[PDB]
Amino acid sequence: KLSEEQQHIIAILLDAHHKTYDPTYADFRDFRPPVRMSPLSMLPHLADLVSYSIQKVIGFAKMIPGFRDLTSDDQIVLLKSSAIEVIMLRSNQSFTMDDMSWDCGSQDYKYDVTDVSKAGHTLELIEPLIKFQVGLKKLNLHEEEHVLLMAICIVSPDRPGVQDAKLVEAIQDRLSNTLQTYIRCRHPPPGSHQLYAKMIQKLADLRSLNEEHSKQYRSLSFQPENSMKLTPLVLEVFGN
């Protein structure tokens, strides 16, 4: 069932994730603080968190078997397009359905609809994002499946601007097979029912969220006063 190589891929992705995701959120204290009374009083803090998250996503992606072996240009495009999606995925670990919020260890760092509203966004985006998280949490994925889904998301050959798609596809196919085989031999019924199919449908939902966020990011960042509240890395990665 699970070949050595596939076990090796999982071993590497789990190590990578462990090294890029602190489930105590200790570093949150170094962000500009959250204000939950400009109207966007949660923008500074949430931009900082996003920025931070982008750095961790980059660290995770560098450990994806083969990813470092792509050209820089393809590494850059893949990361630019996926960053928001991987941050959304990786956020499922703090998300809680108790009260539909992202619970990052304390009340100060517990984010709900109103916080995200205080970051400049609307309910037309915020609602599908909570719906996304609910559906994804309902999957109750194993950590091995979760890290696999993040990597499969990063190594997508249809991202606009990808130069060597045959090589990106090669990587993702390996991750995909490993994921499919993992579920077959590790994920026991009845949680494994059409599990791959639901996980890949989450990748589709993420593209849709990506598209719409890009639109709102475009209207937010268009105002220089709001752009001023973002980070240099965020400006680079999402654009100006």
């Binding site: 980059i58 820089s72 240009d73 590494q75 850059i76 990361l79 630019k80 240099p232 680079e236 990665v237």
Partner: peptide, 11 residues
């Protein structure tokens, strides 16, 4: 393309 901060965190 260019992306000095992104590129630098990758190397």
């Amino acid at each position: 393309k260019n992306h000095p901060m992104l590129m630098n965190l990758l190397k």
